Amino acid sequence: KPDEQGLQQILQLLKESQSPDTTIQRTVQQKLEQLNQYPDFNNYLIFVLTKLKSEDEPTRSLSGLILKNNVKAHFQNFPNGVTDFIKSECLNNIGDSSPLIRATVGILITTIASKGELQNWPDLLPKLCSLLDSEDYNTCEGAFGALQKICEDSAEILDSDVLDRPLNIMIPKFLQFFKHSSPKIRSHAVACVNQFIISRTQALMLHIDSFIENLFALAGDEEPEVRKNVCRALVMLLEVRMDRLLPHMHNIVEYMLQRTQDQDENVALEACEFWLTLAEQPICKDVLVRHLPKLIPVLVNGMKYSDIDIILLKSDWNLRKCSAAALDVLANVYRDELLPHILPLLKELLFHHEWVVKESGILVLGAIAEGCMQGMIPYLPELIPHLIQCLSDKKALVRSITCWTLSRYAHWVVSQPPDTYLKPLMTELLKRILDSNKRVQEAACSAFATLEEEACTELVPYLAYILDTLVFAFSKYQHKNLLILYDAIGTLADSVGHHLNKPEYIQMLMPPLIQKWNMLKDEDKDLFPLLECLSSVATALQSGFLPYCEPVYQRCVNLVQKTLAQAMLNNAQPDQYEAPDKDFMIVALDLLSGLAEGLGGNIEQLVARSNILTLMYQCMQDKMPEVRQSSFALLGDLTKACFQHVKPCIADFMPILGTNLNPEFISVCNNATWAIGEISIQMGIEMQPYIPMVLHQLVEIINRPNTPKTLLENTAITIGRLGYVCPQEVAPMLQQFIRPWCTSLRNIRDNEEKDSAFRGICTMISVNPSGVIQDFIFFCDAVASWINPKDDLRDMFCKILHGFKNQVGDENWRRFSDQFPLPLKERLAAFYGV
């Protein structure tokens, strides 16, 4: 309602913000927001745009575009009378004769809705839909455009019961406009409906046939925007309403196949999406088949680089990306049955004199690798050495997929005599790691990481050569690539294992690894993949990590505390402080688990002068069953490594371990069971008070059906470990637990765990020689499994097998040992004197 020197001061203000130089431009925009606080300001802004026609379009339009930003911040500050003025004005001038003004009017309505949120503009929708029937094109198109953006922004909210259900009238209204005379209008009509396909709104699904009918009718439209939208709708219709789309499938795929090759970039990429979406559906294998001979070449043709990407090298989602993505997933559907259609193409492609073609051939070779692996094997003897040659190709992009494609037959390559395929590959991929092109480094280092996962121990003779080129990469690698190098190094250690543990190698690897460790802030986003990397390296280097373990330990304990303190605050600050990422805790716990597991005794010094056990106790209670899981593992690891610092806590830990002995959480319970077992052996006779709390559950878990064998095995190991240090509490149970205990431990190898467990069964039997006599047939089979028992544990088995044959007689035992296989009977007779 304003005037008039102020209007002139705003007009001059609008003028100045359009000036040539940036000096005057970005000093006036200050005054534009010092008035911004006064809500009366916006009344001028809307006026200039919509009423003050005595001014040029650029000025007026800017005014509304200034007003837009005044909504995108302190709209909560917008008074009711001001908003009601803008709403009113915008909704009237919606179809202004001017293009730019109308565009400005539009975007203003949109933003007021999105922030309005949204029952706060009740008239909006029914008034827009009304203007859809307006006789003027401009008002109608402008209304339709506004509606489309409202759908795009607020589909789930229009669909939601929050604004009632306005779609129950918008949808069947939109469908009628599919028939409209204007190419632009039809476009909007379908674009709007498309939003409510996946969300499968009933307002639409109960008009599916009407929709599909209309959709078919628009398939042949010559305006690209319509065809784009029709395609998007059909693709989407795939996931949701296969039922009604089925008895058209062949017509559809003939349309889509044609439409994949459409002249318009956008239509093509949308149509191509159809093939990716279809592949995922069960009713695919038996539908496409007859189309593969025409689909495959079209798909392979799209996989070539676009002139644009070529120049932008030597986006997230190309035709080529989608085209290959589809091919990969198809190769998985059709397996070797796909080869006939692809194989004769590769012939012509992999040797083609234009590099852009060759590249795509190489990319094809890679995509089909998973599903067609078995059928490709006869050609790999020619193909593998050919690609190894291509790595030396002058075009960088030809080198890069070659790395990736080779990485995708990395399993077959190791399945051969190492000098013939693996060794050449290895050497060449190593040179490519230090390629001068970033894209090729990314590729080769990646591929090599992949290769290492498949090689493991087959790299051992090449270690000195791997490391040499791997550490040099440090003083070359950017960041995107550096991150992959951490992976390359991590995997290397994960492959060779203790083979890396040599003075010479540590001299090269650790210094620049610990150098990068230093210049990482606790907040730096590189710790993420570097903890994973040093976690691996520590494990492999075992005790040899000692001189470098100082800082990695303390920085981890920090993280564990950081995350817990973070979490605590979040329990009362879900407005102030943010929920922490608990995966950082989990890696730190695991890295700590591995430092204790690899440095054994030596960790004591670091465990002592830290709150490691405090935090650990807090971690064993965290709501997330991954944290409790990882931290129970650390408990066992610390019990084993330096029990001296743990002991003054066994009072607190045992209860939590007791209440955390729940089989529904497998990994959690496993590590809980395992911790207990590890503790009892260290506690000796002092472990007595804690027996009854955990024992009754462990016997229930061991006599439980459908239990992962490793949890069952660990329980059997743990139970035995208690009845070795405190046999008086565990031995009176033998009857109920002897059956699955023997059934479990007969399959585990003759390792320290097995000995510890059987030493304990023997002790329990010596004290309770009654519980076993009922099911002694199992005790034989459990003892029969031993290939290499220890001198004394031998004598322990005799004492039992003998004295408990003497307790039954010579003729009873004969009859007892009938059900014995030749390996078993002849074994117990050869080992223990029958």
Side-chain angles (χ1 to χ4, degrees), residues 293-585:
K294 204 169 145 185
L295 213 197
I296 297 305
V298 166
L299 225 45
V300 170
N301 194 45
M303 280 163 72
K304 297 150 88 178
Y305 278 115
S306 67
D307 291 279
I308 338 310
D309 297 324
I310 302 275
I311 260 72
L312 194 38
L313 289 152
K314 265 68 59 198
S315 182
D316 213 356
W317 197 247
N318 299 343
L319 171 64
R320 162 183 164 105
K321 303 293 183 53
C322 175
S323 281
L327 190 65
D328 179 291
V329 191
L330 281 179
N332 281 298
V333 158
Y334 286 118
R335 317 283 319 190
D336 311 296
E337 197 201 338
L338 192 84
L339 284 152
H341 305 83
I342 202 84
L343 215 45
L345 268 73
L346 286 174
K347 254 256 287 181
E348 169 211 304
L349 296 166
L350 296 155
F351 307 98
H352 206 286
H353 267 311
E354 294 150 24
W355 79 265
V356 186
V357 193
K358 204 179 227 198
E359 202 276 351
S360 70
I362 299 184
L363 168 51
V364 165
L365 218 170
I368 56 174
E370 201 179 8
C372 313
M373 184 56 77
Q374 306 323 300
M376 281 299 287
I377 299 172
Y379 310 99
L380 298 172
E382 319 96 74
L383 290 168
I384 297 296
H386 174 45
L387 304 164
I388 291 174
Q389 193 74 353
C390 289
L391 286 154
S392 310
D393 184 274
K394 62 168 184 274
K395 292 264 78 54
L397 289 173
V398 175
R399 305 201 287 273
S400 75
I401 14 84
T402 314
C403 293
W404 176 88
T405 296
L406 282 162
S407 84
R408 266 210 132 206
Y409 297 97
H411 180 50
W412 184 87
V413 160
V414 308
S415 87
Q416 313 286 310
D419 288 0
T420 69
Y421 296 108
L422 178 76
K423 182 186 198 190
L425 177 61
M426 196 121 76
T427 311
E428 289 305 297
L429 220 44
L430 280 180
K431 303 184 169 198
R432 259 45 271 159
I433 287 173
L434 292 329
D435 196 296
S436 66
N437 185 292
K438 292 188 212 188
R439 185 92 158 167
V440 186
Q441 302 174 328
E442 184 175 13
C445 196
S446 275
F448 200 85
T450 278
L451 188 63
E452 291 175 323
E453 300 212 21
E454 292 279 332
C456 31
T457 67
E458 272 278 31
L459 303 164
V460 168
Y462 300 55
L463 259 172
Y465 293 43
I466 311 290
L467 281 147
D468 214 50
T469 69
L470 273 204
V471 293
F472 182 75
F474 276 127
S475 62
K476 201 190 185 89
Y477 272 179
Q478 322 282 150
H479 184 275
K480 200 196 189 198
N481 294 4
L482 169 68
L483 235 59
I484 311 171
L485 176 63
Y486 292 142
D487 189 34
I489 292 151
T491 285
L492 205 195
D494 274 333
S495 292
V496 295
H498 97 280
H499 286 295
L500 189 68
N501 196 345
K502 293 187 194 290
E504 54 197 49
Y505 298 151
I506 297 164
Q507 300 296 291
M508 306 180 276
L509 185 52
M510 294 302 308
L513 237 179
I514 215 86
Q515 192 280 333
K516 290 277 192 178
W517 172 263
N518 279 198
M519 54 164 52
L520 290 205
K521 254 57 193 170
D522 201 292
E523 305 68 23
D524 194 327
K525 294 198 175 63
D526 264 297
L527 286 178
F528 313 26
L530 197 36
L531 291 180
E532 305 245 312
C533 175
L534 283 150
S535 176
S536 290
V537 166
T539 302
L541 297 188
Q542 285 132 40
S543 54
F545 194 77
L546 212 167
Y548 310 86
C549 92
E550 157 74 67
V552 69
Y553 177 90
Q554 54 172 326
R555 167 65 75 95
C556 281
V557 215
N558 270 343
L559 262 278
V560 180
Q561 195 155 24
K562 245 90 81 171
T563 316
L564 283 162
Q566 274 264 77
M568 250 199 286
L569 282 168
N570 195 231
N571 215 109
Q573 279 195 333
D575 75 314
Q576 263 285 287
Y577 249 76
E578 194 186 303
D581 191 343
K582 286 181 184 172
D583 301 6
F584 283 76
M585 198 147 66

